[PDB]
Amino acid sequence: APDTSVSNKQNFSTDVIYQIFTDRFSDGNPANNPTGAAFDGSCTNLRLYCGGDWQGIINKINDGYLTGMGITAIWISQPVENIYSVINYSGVNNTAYHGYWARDFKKTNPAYGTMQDFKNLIDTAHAHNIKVIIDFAPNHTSPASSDDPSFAENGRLYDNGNLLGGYTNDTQNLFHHYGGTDFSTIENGIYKNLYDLADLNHNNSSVDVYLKDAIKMWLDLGVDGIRVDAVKHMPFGWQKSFMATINNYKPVFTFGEWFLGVNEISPEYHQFANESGMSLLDYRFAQKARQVFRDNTDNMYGLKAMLEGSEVDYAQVNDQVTFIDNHDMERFHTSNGDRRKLEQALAFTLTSRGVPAIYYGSEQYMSGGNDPDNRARLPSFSTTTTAYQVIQKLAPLRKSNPAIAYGSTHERWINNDVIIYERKFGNNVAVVAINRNMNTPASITGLVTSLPRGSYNDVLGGILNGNTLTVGAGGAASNFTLAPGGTAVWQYTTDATTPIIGNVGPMMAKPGVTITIDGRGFGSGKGTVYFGTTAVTGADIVAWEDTQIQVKIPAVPGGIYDIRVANAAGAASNIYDNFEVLTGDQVTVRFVINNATTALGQNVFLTGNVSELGNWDPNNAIGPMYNQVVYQYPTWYYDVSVPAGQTIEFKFLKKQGSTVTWEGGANRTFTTPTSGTATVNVNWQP
Ligand SMILES: [Ca+2]
Ligand SMILES: [Ca+2]
């Protein structure tokens, strides 16, 4: 089926996501509304339920509000049953309207609808070529106090109505009992509770298996994507076995949220996007777009440097979800902000690399500060705002122009207030010119592009004051004046003759799993897929057409491989790197080592004989391990995704700078479980 099909659950670069807080969008069925203290139909107390549900989203797909805009994916609130308590936090009452306080991950939140309403949403969205992404928040259940069993629902977890346990008198240790995080370290933020939310213990086998069974159920109901909440607050090792469960079962696009503040660049963030199996909400893009287009705290050179730098730092930049605001940020549009600023930032996001996500109500110019003021009910479903027309004209180019869905980003002209960039994929081109200065015209001279000669009409139709571009010989544009606030988009599409790979999903899975390779120029006849130097042909290629190949991963050893495609004529594509073949199914094992004293700056790591442990290479060892919360120095510990049902060999080592000190003695051995978790508790061998 083509890369642009609604059935492509693995890659979303050709999509535009609309992020919906279910409760704040449309109340299509008032009979399922919470009653009493939990409900506010006027939606003026924004911490209560206002009544929005899945029938409301179905109505807005059916009547053309969402499809008229060109939206091809909706991101909705976590669908699972939440606690029913109205919690009074210092006078103000609070409900689970946001979906984040789960009590049963196998049932629906009845305020949103029944299981049949969820199914009708999937089917209605798919029948209108809209993919459905759900939030999933496996880090916690709900607010709880072990000291006060009567507070809220005591964080209790049910499995399809059967109570597994609560936070008070947690004899099975389903939860962590280490106190609340102060966010001082990543370790601290993982094993301690976020605020008062009962922290799930993923090293408990019942919890591990339950959460994995639960995500499979939602995959079985037809969801096309998962946004995982709080990825910075769960063990990386556990989340990698969780991604392995999804990808080895029914791979769908998965991305997490790891917040970054203005000008913050975090190596751990980029390492998570590059090695976890899921991509991220691109905060780096979002914060810089807001500094240049909203707050005027940086100029176009800052924008250029983020675009150029992120192309390198993210191994798969076409998988990052971009946005200009969302549920954790003040709305982009302010009371005294010019509406053109929002209109340009939306144009920039819709034509840039990644997967664009538009927060509900952007097209209606909603203003609002932080939580909960950025979650007001949508005021209007007017389909004629300039913001609605901008998304309506640009969001289709993601399906029609592969340079926008997949291409490289190249700055063609710039100064403090103007950027003209080009997106290029094969011979498909899109060129975007943005003047953020609302008062001054920009004289453009010397612009050169990859456009064939012609008179290109602005895809926006002049609504943001764009103009026609005349391109002469050799891609040289005739000189022009870009209007104050001007934004224009010019494009050219044609066939690719050469194979070009634009995206691959999933990027981590065991031998036997079918992966999806999207791009252009693959041709109609079945050709060859290379995993490193291993060629895959014939029956292992499940489908081949010009924009998409589906192929089974060969039985090669675990490790990182480059993907390359050769069409039937033997012409080969660009290399798509960093694909991880797993040794097999994954389980998370906690490795604990005692008596490992270290010097300043010296940490303990783990390595062993499978790719998941770095195949004995100190530079790819797992760690640095932890030593403060669950166990304390000189005991170190870490949760690691390792192949299931196998005897692995390993050794611990200390690293400080370039110096590696290996444990002495024989290599350690351990036979991993087939499912669930296990703990290895050992003593440093001198
Ligand atoms: Ca309702
Ligand atoms: Ca946690």
XYZ file of C-alpha atoms and ligand atoms in Angstrom:
688
model
C 0.000 0.000 0.000
C 1.577 3.515 -0.489
C 3.618 5.311 2.141
C 0.775 7.871 2.533
C -1.891 5.270 3.351
C -3.804 5.430 6.622
C -2.734 1.796 7.136
C 0.940 2.836 7.549
C 1.066 2.618 11.350
C 4.855 2.701 11.430
C 5.821 6.135 10.055
C 4.036 9.438 10.326
C 6.189 12.011 8.475
C 3.452 12.303 5.798
C 0.889 13.122 8.528
C -0.271 16.163 10.428
C -1.325 15.281 13.973
C -4.102 17.252 15.798
C -3.602 16.958 19.605
C -6.933 16.798 21.441
C -7.657 16.926 25.181
C -10.769 14.711 24.809
C -12.704 16.442 27.576
C -12.236 19.905 26.103
C -13.121 19.301 22.476
C -16.788 18.248 22.001
C -19.390 16.676 24.223
C -21.127 14.449 21.714
C -22.912 12.369 24.372
C -24.128 14.221 27.504
C -25.461 10.979 29.082
C -21.870 9.862 29.836
C -20.966 13.107 31.598
C -19.686 12.811 35.226
C -22.163 14.266 37.729
C -21.912 16.334 40.812
C -18.720 17.744 42.134
C -16.760 16.172 39.250
C -18.582 18.022 36.463
C -18.739 21.607 35.253
C -20.742 22.006 32.068
C -19.753 25.667 31.762
C -16.117 24.560 31.747
C -15.061 27.604 33.753
C -13.334 25.498 36.502
C -10.737 23.934 34.213
C -9.807 21.110 36.639
C -13.188 19.468 36.403
C -14.760 17.445 33.624
C -16.487 19.693 31.024
C -18.028 16.648 29.185
C -16.007 16.147 25.932
C -15.902 12.582 24.649
C -15.142 10.198 21.744
C -18.591 10.721 20.152
C -17.678 14.414 19.960
C -14.503 13.642 18.010
C -16.497 11.272 15.706
C -18.960 14.120 15.016
C -16.157 16.497 14.115
C -14.551 14.012 11.762
C -17.963 13.261 10.121
C -19.034 16.825 9.610
C -15.745 17.838 8.038
C -14.260 20.177 10.736
C -11.112 18.033 11.143
C -10.872 16.630 7.602
C -11.466 20.098 5.997
C -8.310 21.174 7.745
C -6.224 18.395 6.192
C -5.562 16.660 9.588
C -4.547 13.032 9.019
C -3.859 11.852 12.630
C -5.490 12.708 15.980
C -3.631 12.387 19.319
C -6.127 11.840 22.172
C -6.101 11.605 25.996
C -5.190 8.255 27.587
C -8.265 6.049 26.995
C -8.037 3.863 30.104
C -10.235 3.939 33.174
C -9.138 6.657 35.629
C -9.996 7.220 39.331
C -13.392 8.650 40.087
C -12.359 10.777 43.129
C -12.668 14.570 43.149
C -9.461 15.574 44.949
C -9.371 18.805 46.845
C -5.884 20.281 46.645
C -6.038 23.223 49.042
C -9.527 24.291 48.337
C -9.608 23.552 44.615
C -11.279 20.425 43.422
C -9.476 18.286 40.812
C -10.635 15.413 38.605
C -8.976 12.957 36.192
C -10.351 14.928 33.154
C -6.908 14.703 31.549
C -6.759 10.873 31.525
C -3.476 10.697 33.456
C -4.585 9.020 36.713
C -5.196 5.438 35.648
C -6.786 2.704 37.746
C -7.376 0.013 35.073
C -5.370 -0.037 31.858
C -7.665 -2.656 30.385
C -10.970 -0.750 30.493
C -12.092 2.645 29.124
C -12.722 5.875 30.965
C -16.566 5.907 30.801
C -16.706 9.683 30.616
C -14.974 9.378 27.259
C -17.081 6.385 26.209
C -17.420 2.597 26.166
C -15.245 0.047 24.409
C -17.755 0.125 21.497
C -17.441 3.945 21.332
C -13.641 3.525 21.145
C -14.046 1.000 18.300
C -16.412 3.356 16.475
C -13.728 6.096 16.815
C -11.038 3.898 15.312
C -13.283 2.858 12.442
C -14.596 6.395 11.769
C -11.114 7.871 11.797
C -9.699 5.133 9.536
C -12.650 5.488 7.104
C -11.667 9.158 6.776
C -7.910 8.424 6.478
C -7.136 9.551 9.980
C -4.761 7.655 12.193
C -5.402 7.558 15.971
C -2.568 8.074 18.516
C -3.374 7.432 22.213
C -1.486 8.631 25.310
C -0.231 5.808 27.509
C 1.196 6.600 30.935
C 2.814 3.445 32.434
C 4.818 5.331 35.058
C 2.074 5.626 37.727
C -1.575 4.991 38.647
C -3.106 7.986 40.566
C -2.586 10.331 43.667
C -2.046 8.273 46.819
C -0.820 8.426 50.380
C 0.274 5.191 52.042
C -0.207 7.021 55.366
C -3.796 7.915 54.573
C -5.586 4.957 52.876
C -8.676 7.144 52.479
C -7.071 9.730 50.274
C -8.463 9.437 46.693
C -8.491 5.724 45.623
C -5.128 4.917 47.287
C -3.442 4.578 43.872
C -5.179 1.156 43.405
C -4.536 -0.844 40.247
C -7.148 -3.147 38.826
C -6.719 -5.677 36.003
C -10.003 -5.631 34.060
C -11.951 -5.177 37.275
C -9.815 -7.445 39.462
C -7.943 -5.499 42.136
C -4.306 -6.115 42.044
C -3.306 -3.804 44.937
C -3.103 -0.353 46.511
C -0.391 1.933 47.815
C -1.112 1.335 51.541
C -0.170 -2.202 52.591
C 1.515 -2.976 49.342
C 2.907 -6.397 50.365
C 3.478 -7.479 46.704
C 5.545 -4.286 46.070
C 3.610 -3.199 43.012
C 4.757 0.348 43.751
C 7.827 2.227 44.803
C 7.989 3.510 48.375
C 10.942 5.798 48.350
C 9.288 9.185 48.870
C 8.797 11.928 46.251
C 11.344 13.210 43.739
C 13.034 16.564 44.042
C 14.208 16.088 40.407
C 17.891 16.482 41.412
C 19.099 13.556 39.341
C 17.656 11.389 36.621
C 17.955 8.427 39.079
C 16.017 10.339 41.718
C 13.271 11.221 39.222
C 12.820 7.568 38.128
C 12.477 5.642 41.394
C 10.826 8.271 43.568
C 7.212 9.413 43.035
C 6.336 12.316 40.700
C 4.431 14.635 43.121
C 1.901 12.262 44.837
C 1.372 9.827 41.986
C 1.838 6.220 43.086
C 4.973 5.105 41.215
C 4.657 1.713 39.511
C 7.436 -0.727 40.153
C 8.390 -2.216 36.756
C 10.897 -4.631 38.317
C 7.821 -6.396 39.799
C 6.964 -9.230 37.305
C 3.214 -8.818 37.753
C 3.500 -5.118 36.895
C 5.813 -5.746 33.954
C 3.605 -8.396 32.347
C 0.335 -6.509 33.069
C 1.521 -3.325 31.328
C 2.804 -5.269 28.340
C -0.491 -7.245 28.096
C -2.367 -3.972 28.382
C -0.559 -2.172 25.491
C -1.077 -5.244 23.286
C -4.823 -5.055 23.933
C -4.963 -1.450 22.739
C -2.833 -2.424 19.690
C -5.381 -5.152 19.066
C -8.123 -2.544 19.052
C -6.480 -0.814 16.033
C -4.574 2.168 17.450
C -1.976 3.586 15.094
C 0.417 5.327 17.498
C 1.343 5.699 21.198
C 2.554 8.828 22.982
C 4.279 7.677 26.179
C 4.076 10.017 29.102
C 7.065 10.731 31.393
C 9.850 8.793 29.665
C 12.454 10.599 31.812
C 10.862 9.044 34.920
C 10.998 5.330 34.047
C 14.130 3.126 33.726
C 15.525 3.301 30.131
C 16.154 -0.446 30.232
C 12.533 -1.192 31.049
C 11.229 1.153 28.355
C 13.497 -0.557 25.780
C 11.923 -3.972 26.632
C 8.521 -2.293 26.456
C 9.334 -0.949 22.951
C 10.589 -4.412 21.996
C 7.208 -5.916 23.048
C 5.359 -3.470 20.794
C 7.730 -3.738 17.840
C 7.971 -7.511 17.949
C 4.181 -7.755 18.208
C 2.498 -5.034 16.127
C 4.919 -2.096 15.572
C 3.250 1.367 15.566
C 4.783 4.798 15.698
C 5.737 5.490 19.373
C 7.132 8.745 20.775
C 7.687 10.035 24.304
C 7.785 13.279 26.174
C 11.095 14.396 27.743
C 10.730 18.138 28.484
C 13.539 20.550 27.626
C 13.544 24.184 28.621
C 14.683 27.125 26.503
C 18.280 26.696 25.305
C 18.696 23.424 27.194
C 20.443 20.717 25.211
C 20.660 17.401 26.973
C 22.825 14.503 25.817
C 20.571 12.003 27.672
C 17.555 13.296 25.692
C 19.261 12.749 22.354
C 20.581 9.351 23.526
C 17.004 8.358 24.436
C 15.637 9.374 20.984
C 18.486 7.521 19.322
C 18.541 4.240 21.252
C 15.230 3.595 23.003
C 13.112 2.422 20.143
C 10.729 5.429 20.295
C 11.187 8.986 19.077
C 10.503 12.173 21.051
C 8.405 15.270 21.133
C 10.926 17.694 19.658
C 11.239 20.294 22.424
C 14.445 21.539 20.893
C 12.519 22.584 17.777
C 9.612 23.910 19.762
C 11.529 26.079 22.222
C 13.670 27.632 19.446
C 10.606 28.208 17.186
C 9.000 30.066 20.144
C 12.167 32.133 20.751
C 12.277 33.261 17.114
C 8.632 33.555 16.188
C 6.953 34.305 19.541
C 9.216 35.804 22.166
C 11.845 37.498 20.016
C 14.649 36.166 22.182
C 16.612 34.744 19.219
C 16.799 35.538 15.511
C 16.864 33.557 12.237
C 20.475 32.433 12.737
C 19.362 30.653 15.939
C 16.632 28.959 13.916
C 19.131 27.937 11.197
C 21.538 26.595 13.791
C 18.772 24.468 15.460
C 17.585 23.097 12.113
C 21.122 22.267 10.977
C 22.235 20.910 14.333
C 19.152 18.726 14.905
C 19.594 17.080 11.513
C 22.831 15.591 12.898
C 22.058 15.065 16.566
C 18.911 13.024 15.972
C 19.766 9.758 14.248
C 16.262 9.682 12.687
C 15.155 13.338 12.491
C 12.104 12.437 10.353
C 10.600 10.658 13.383
C 10.576 13.584 15.801
C 7.156 15.180 16.513
C 7.372 18.971 16.222
C 4.991 21.588 17.645
C 4.882 25.244 18.702
C 2.824 24.614 21.886
C 1.099 21.742 23.661
C -0.404 20.705 27.029
C 2.780 21.591 28.995
C 3.328 25.100 27.705
C 1.631 28.473 27.572
C -0.408 28.791 24.363
C 1.666 30.355 21.578
C -0.851 33.090 20.782
C -0.885 35.850 23.503
C -3.430 38.660 24.185
C -1.206 41.318 22.729
C 0.472 39.038 20.181
C -0.020 39.675 16.466
C -1.982 36.764 14.902
C 0.466 36.621 11.973
C 3.117 35.331 14.423
C 0.969 32.246 15.083
C 0.145 31.922 11.392
C 3.841 31.952 10.413
C 4.902 29.521 13.161
C 2.240 27.099 11.941
C 3.451 27.481 8.328
C 7.049 26.884 9.465
C 6.048 23.731 11.466
C 3.871 22.281 8.672
C 6.703 22.603 6.076
C 9.604 21.462 8.345
C 11.104 18.063 8.955
C 9.581 15.628 11.472
C 5.932 14.845 12.208
C 3.969 18.146 12.879
C 1.466 18.189 15.785
C -1.030 21.073 16.096
C -2.553 21.597 19.555
C -6.353 21.751 19.427
C -7.755 25.226 19.196
C -4.585 26.777 17.604
C -6.694 27.478 14.496
C -9.136 29.466 16.652
C -6.340 31.623 18.250
C -6.855 30.370 21.812
C -4.641 32.244 24.341
C -3.881 30.823 27.832
C -1.052 30.420 30.357
C 0.174 27.152 31.819
C -1.865 24.210 33.097
C -4.821 24.270 33.294
C -5.296 27.544 31.449
C -3.862 26.099 28.228
C -6.625 23.399 28.323
C -9.810 25.520 27.893
C -12.726 24.145 25.867
C -12.438 24.935 22.151
C -14.510 28.192 21.768
C -15.612 27.880 18.164
C -15.582 25.426 15.245
C -15.339 28.210 12.694
C -13.847 26.866 9.507
C -12.940 30.252 8.067
C -10.183 31.642 10.333
C -6.891 32.472 8.543
C -5.220 29.892 10.775
C -7.685 27.244 9.593
C -6.918 28.109 5.913
C -3.143 28.011 6.483
C -3.349 24.428 7.852
C -5.895 23.480 5.123
C -3.475 24.624 2.376
C -0.237 23.300 3.843
C -1.137 20.028 5.641
C -1.934 18.219 2.258
C 1.613 18.840 0.997
C 2.791 16.270 3.563
C 1.006 13.588 1.598
C 1.692 15.029 -1.848
C 5.245 16.356 -1.678
C 7.902 13.861 -0.450
C 10.424 16.748 -0.133
C 8.216 18.038 2.760
C 7.574 14.612 4.267
C 11.199 13.393 4.027
C 13.640 15.864 2.609
C 16.778 17.487 3.821
C 16.609 21.143 4.965
C 18.880 23.682 3.288
C 19.085 27.346 4.111
C 19.094 29.267 0.772
C 18.902 32.901 2.015
C 18.978 34.508 5.485
C 19.368 37.592 7.579
C 18.185 38.401 11.169
C 14.520 38.405 10.291
C 14.195 36.351 7.083
C 14.848 32.748 6.302
C 14.235 31.034 2.941
C 14.834 27.268 3.214
C 14.443 24.455 0.748
C 13.355 20.908 1.401
C 14.640 18.408 -1.134
C 13.956 14.726 -1.790
C 15.062 13.384 -5.120
C 13.862 15.987 -7.540
C 10.957 17.035 -5.415
C 11.462 20.500 -3.938
C 9.574 22.848 -1.590
C 10.943 26.352 -0.856
C 9.578 28.406 2.063
C 10.272 32.113 2.623
C 9.360 33.715 5.965
C 9.833 37.406 6.934
C 9.054 37.596 10.701
C 9.446 41.377 10.753
C 5.948 42.763 10.775
C 7.011 46.286 9.774
C 9.861 46.061 7.273
C 9.835 44.655 3.683
C 12.845 42.414 2.853
C 14.658 42.872 -0.509
C 15.680 39.370 -1.697
C 18.565 39.327 -4.171
C 20.614 36.400 -5.310
C 18.237 33.615 -4.288
C 19.177 30.280 -5.914
C 16.978 27.123 -5.603
C 16.610 23.609 -7.026
C 13.336 24.565 -8.706
C 13.111 23.971 -12.518
C 12.387 27.198 -14.446
C 8.783 28.418 -14.212
C 6.429 30.871 -12.491
C 5.561 29.222 -9.186
C 2.368 30.230 -7.440
C 2.388 30.557 -3.708
C 0.655 27.456 -2.254
C -0.782 29.765 0.488
C -2.577 31.898 -2.237
C -1.185 35.181 -0.870
C -3.096 34.839 2.457
C 0.106 35.513 4.420
C 1.158 38.001 1.738
C 3.263 35.597 -0.286
C 3.993 36.163 -3.957
C 4.745 34.323 -7.171
C 8.333 33.141 -7.632
C 9.863 33.404 -11.122
C 12.752 30.924 -11.500
C 15.016 31.232 -14.501
C 17.975 29.212 -15.639
C 19.848 27.227 -13.125
C 17.265 27.650 -10.295
C 17.936 31.419 -9.994
C 14.928 33.398 -8.838
C 14.081 36.836 -10.221
C 14.616 39.387 -7.403
C 11.603 40.268 -5.194
C 10.466 42.074 -2.068
C 9.142 39.852 0.705
C 6.272 41.736 2.414
C 6.280 42.609 6.175
C 5.129 39.374 7.806
C 5.342 37.623 4.378
C 5.220 33.836 4.110
C 5.128 31.893 0.872
C 5.604 28.275 -0.152
C 6.604 27.235 -3.680
C 6.957 23.583 -4.725
C 7.743 21.179 -7.563
C 7.070 17.403 -7.598
C 8.096 14.717 -10.069
C 9.102 11.000 -10.060
C 12.182 9.630 -8.457
C 14.080 7.312 -10.738
C 16.745 6.349 -8.151
C 15.648 4.572 -4.892
C 15.650 7.147 -2.029
C 14.710 5.954 1.488
C 12.859 8.665 3.478
C 11.969 6.733 6.658
C 12.048 3.197 8.177
C 9.839 1.972 11.067
C 10.204 0.192 13.463
C 13.945 0.805 13.982
C 14.550 -1.966 16.561
C 13.088 -5.511 16.409
C 14.049 -9.180 16.334
C 14.617 -11.346 13.144
C 11.295 -12.255 11.510
C 9.482 -8.962 12.105
C 8.242 -7.067 9.032
C 9.553 -3.500 8.932
C 8.284 -0.643 6.682
C 10.658 1.355 4.422
C 9.126 4.465 2.822
C 10.567 6.658 0.132
C 10.428 7.130 -3.620
C 11.773 5.419 -6.739
C 11.725 1.792 -5.454
C 9.934 0.799 -8.653
C 7.120 -1.662 -9.142
C 9.206 -4.803 -9.482
C 10.563 -6.529 -6.397
C 14.275 -5.711 -5.835
C 16.742 -6.233 -2.942
C 16.880 -5.008 0.635
C 20.336 -5.026 2.286
C 20.847 -5.319 6.026
C 24.514 -4.551 6.073
C 25.894 -6.883 3.349
C 23.053 -9.414 3.807
C 20.611 -9.328 0.889
C 16.943 -10.023 1.399
C 14.959 -10.888 -1.681
C 11.933 -12.759 -2.889
C 9.526 -14.192 -0.381
C 11.037 -12.393 2.587
C 10.002 -9.121 0.908
C 6.373 -8.991 1.965
C 5.344 -6.052 -0.315
C 7.216 -3.818 -2.811
C 5.901 -0.776 -4.614
C 7.365 2.534 -5.547
C 6.811 4.382 -2.261
C 6.925 1.532 0.240
C 8.642 -1.796 0.866
C 7.721 -4.165 3.679
C 10.399 -6.773 4.401
C 11.188 -9.333 7.110
C 14.361 -8.742 9.162
C 16.921 -11.531 8.257
C 18.364 -13.869 10.834
C 21.539 -11.896 11.315
C 23.292 -11.536 14.721
C 22.059 -8.755 17.025
C 23.664 -5.365 16.400
C 23.316 -2.076 14.504
C 22.930 -2.267 10.652
C 22.678 0.085 7.690
C 19.647 -0.464 5.430
C 19.975 -0.009 1.678
C 17.537 -0.789 -1.122
C 18.411 -1.727 -4.698
C 15.582 -1.580 -7.237
C 15.154 -4.408 -9.806
C 17.692 -2.648 -12.093
C 20.349 -2.930 -9.405
C 20.332 0.876 -8.764
C 20.978 1.413 -4.992
C 19.534 3.959 -2.496
C 21.074 6.123 0.185
C 22.035 4.278 3.396
C 19.538 4.484 6.230
C 21.606 3.720 9.284
C 21.269 2.857 12.952
C 18.774 0.012 12.625
C 18.995 -2.295 15.649
C 18.395 -6.022 15.177
C 17.642 -7.477 18.630
C 19.065 -10.876 19.707
C 15.451 -11.878 20.393
C 12.557 -11.150 22.702
C 13.501 -8.857 25.590
C 13.089 -8.972 29.405
C 14.403 -6.394 31.877
C 16.825 -7.728 34.466
C 18.050 -5.669 37.399
C 21.817 -6.074 37.853
C 23.033 -5.291 41.374
C 26.704 -5.298 42.354
C 28.039 -4.852 45.849
C 31.448 -3.692 47.092
C 32.370 -1.651 44.034
C 34.129 1.315 45.537
C 35.161 3.994 42.985
C 37.226 7.185 42.792
C 35.923 10.640 41.867
C 34.518 10.478 38.345
C 34.780 6.698 38.183
C 31.543 4.811 37.618
C 30.504 1.177 37.258
C 29.233 -0.219 33.928
C 28.108 -3.583 32.646
C 29.017 -5.413 29.405
C 28.699 -8.919 28.043
C 28.412 -11.150 25.072
C 25.197 -10.059 23.281
C 24.604 -6.785 21.371
C 22.227 -5.628 24.078
C 25.193 -5.550 26.472
C 27.667 -3.958 23.987
C 29.355 -7.255 22.876
C 32.260 -6.844 25.312
C 33.143 -3.329 24.129
C 33.910 -0.867 27.027
C 32.853 2.045 24.804
C 29.425 0.543 24.475
C 29.073 -0.729 28.059
C 25.732 -0.203 29.897
C 25.747 2.583 32.379
C 26.854 4.439 34.364
C 24.850 2.396 36.822
C 22.940 3.963 39.706
C 23.805 3.955 43.422
C 21.495 6.272 45.546
C 17.802 5.285 45.762
C 17.072 1.540 45.445
C 20.536 0.527 46.664
C 23.309 2.829 47.926
C 26.961 3.092 47.159
C 29.100 0.980 47.170
C 26.265 -1.142 45.824
C 25.349 -0.108 42.288
C 22.261 -1.240 40.295
C 20.617 -0.797 36.861
C 17.631 -2.125 34.890
C 18.769 -3.527 31.522
C 16.878 -4.938 28.526
C 18.493 -8.297 27.669
C 17.431 -11.255 25.378
C 14.888 -13.585 26.971
C 15.470 -17.298 27.734
C 19.231 -17.245 27.087
C 22.449 -17.747 29.127
C 24.413 -14.501 28.776
C 27.981 -13.898 29.849
C 28.993 -10.627 31.421
C 31.397 -8.787 33.618
C 31.269 -5.477 35.398
C 33.897 -2.795 34.888
C 34.767 0.660 36.276
C 35.532 3.485 33.785
C 37.130 6.848 34.582
C 38.032 8.822 31.474
C 39.829 6.375 29.172
C 40.827 3.924 31.894
C 38.788 0.727 32.147
C 39.213 -1.594 35.140
C 37.551 -5.003 34.544
C 36.465 -7.325 37.338
C 38.956 -10.176 37.763
C 37.967 -13.845 37.819
C 35.884 -15.853 35.347
C 33.121 -14.233 33.252
C 29.703 -14.319 34.979
C 26.812 -16.274 33.475
C 23.092 -15.921 34.014
C 20.161 -17.621 32.316
C 17.487 -14.996 31.638
C 13.721 -15.665 32.203
C 11.357 -16.006 29.218
C 9.012 -13.258 30.542
C 8.851 -11.045 33.638
C 11.869 -9.678 35.360
C 14.787 -11.015 37.319
C 17.440 -9.628 39.700
C 21.172 -10.497 39.548
C 22.863 -9.722 42.850
C 26.625 -10.173 42.876
C 29.864 -8.967 44.560
C 32.764 -7.249 42.713
C 35.482 -9.857 41.910
C 38.910 -8.193 42.292
Ca -20.013 13.572 27.411
Ca 8.969 6.162 37.888
